[PDB]
């Protein structure tokens, strides 16, 4: 089992910085997940209207929101690549680190390389197919932002060295924050 | 003559699906598809396509299954679906003997009842049910919103499917 403190942005219209305002200047979700190999009863618990979901429901939400927020952050940070633009940059870097912690806590449910189910460790092609409709829904020109993201993950894997899309995605977002931080000097 | 394709998708919940399908050229059975969402086996019973070409076809079908499941998950997350649930997709291309334009179709049924179907003329999906619902409206909005579910789908039916029939 594990404890995952999730920083969940909204599901409504607004600037990502404004949506995550209290996180940037510091109230989001404490989860508790349980996992077993042959047991199908794998459930997650939301503490503090508190909910009980299946692991698959929680994991789908987590991946879907990671992908939606990445696109939202990237479009906000591309617009300024200004005072809030440096503040947006600092909150994004803080957010990447928060998402890396969330991911490592989720990974504690496994503790095996070959034994991490294909279902939760998809490659770029699979991930981009699986979450096409879910992520695309949110955005105006969603189809194009999704293709842009896939090509950029494909560039990341080509520059580094088949392997998990989430790790390639973390590399892409860590790079955006690096470019972002370096630019805030001038 | 024709290529028909049938896909039955048994959803125990939004996250788990068992696929069972097949395809036929003319009168007889040429392909079989079976397995859970993560490990679906796709086979050509006869060596119609050479190894490289078959691998490409399998890749396209596997991408389709992931996207299909993704759409079902989205409809549930946005509008709520009642599970367990079965979806049937029946699609294909038929080449008239006279020589006119191929007749193409893609019909979707849910729990044995007509739901939505593709209209290739303008590459748009329509409701086949007379029961209006948020679910039907939402599903159609999604299907009619993207190049993938409209134009690429029409090209699969009018071009890929037709060329496959002409070849074998
Ligand atoms: C030359 C070789 C070709 C011949 C192949 C023969 C092999 C037969 C295999 C045997 C098994 C038969 C059953 C499987 C049928 C699948 C049909 C494939 C369709 C497909 O791949 O369409 C692609 C688009 O995908 C999409 O459109 C995905 C979107 C999902 C839409 C789902 C439909 C509606 C469901 C509604 C559910 C909602 C739930 C609410 C209750 C077209 O693209 P492409 O292959 O041309 O490549 C373009 C490269 N970019
Ligand atoms: C597609 O068909 C499915 C069965 O063929 C159907 O599932 C059935 O749904 C009912 C209602 O949700 C379940 O009944 C249970 O829930 C009600 C809730 O009010 C209770 O009162 C009952 O006592 C019962 O516990 C059935 O159990 C379920 N069938 C099976 C075999 O699991 C789907 O709802 C259908 N889906 C669509 C979209 O039409
Ligand atoms: C794919 O699925 C099944 C495999 O047997 C076939 O469905 C049967 O079709 C015949 C008529 O052709 C009916 O008498 C049976 O009742 C059907 N089965 C069921 C369970 O309803 C189907 O023909 C196969 N092939 C194609 C191209 O769909
Ligand atoms: C993944 O690959 C195939 C399914 O795609 C699995 O093999 C299947 O085994 C069951 C039960 O014996 C059969 O109903 C299938 O038709 C078999 N498929 C093939 C291709 O032979 C295989 O066991 C799966 N492995 C894992 C670890 O998930
Ligand atoms: C969709 O296809 C048409 C061609 O029919 C094209 O003009 C358009 O740019 C395509 N791309 C997207 C993402 O809409």
Author numbering:
A (entry chain C): 503 to 528, 536 to 557, 565 to 597, 605 to 684, 692 to 716
B (entry chain D): 9 to 176
Kindly provide excerpts from the paper associated with this entry:
The PfEMP1 family of surface proteins is central for Plasmodium falciparum virulence and must retain the ability to bind to host receptors while also diversifying to aid immune evasion. The interaction between CIDRα1 domains of PfEMP1 and endothelial protein C receptor (EPCR) is associated with severe childhood malaria. We combine crystal structures of CIDRα1:EPCR complexes with analysis of 885 CIDRα1 sequences, showing that the EPCR-binding surfaces of CIDRα1 domains are conserved in shape and bonding potential, despite dramatic sequence diversity. Additionally, these domains mimic features of the natural EPCR ligand and can block this ligand interaction.
Crystals of the HB3var03 CIDRα1.4:EPCR complex formed and diffracted to 2.65Å resolution. The structure was consistent with an envelope obtained from solution small-angle X-ray scattering, and the two copies of HB3var03 CIDRα1 in the asymmetric unit aligned with a root-mean-square deviation (rmsd) of just 0.09Å, showing them to be extremely similar. The HB3var03 CIDRα1:EPCR interface has a surface area of 978Å2 and surrounds the kinked helix. At its center is a small hydrophobic patch containing F656 and F655, which interact with a hydrophobic patch on EPCR. In particular, F656 is positioned at the bend in the kinked α helix, where it protrudes from the domain surface, allowing it to insert into the hydrophobic groove of EPCR. This patch lies within a larger surface that is complementary in shape to EPCR and contains a series of amino acids (D576, K642, D652, S653, Q657, Y660, and K661) that make hydrogen bonds to EPCR side chains. However, the F656A mutation, which removes the majority of this interaction, had a 35-fold effect on the affinity and significantly increased the off rate, with a 100-fold change in the dissociation rate constant. Therefore, the insertion of F656 into the hydrophobic groove of EPCR increases the lifetime of the complex. In particular, F4 binds to the same site as F656 from HB3var03 CIDRα1. The CIDRα1-binding site is larger than that of protein C, extending to make contacts with two additional EPCR loops (residues 22–25 and 44–47) through K642 of the HB3var03 CIDRα1 domain.
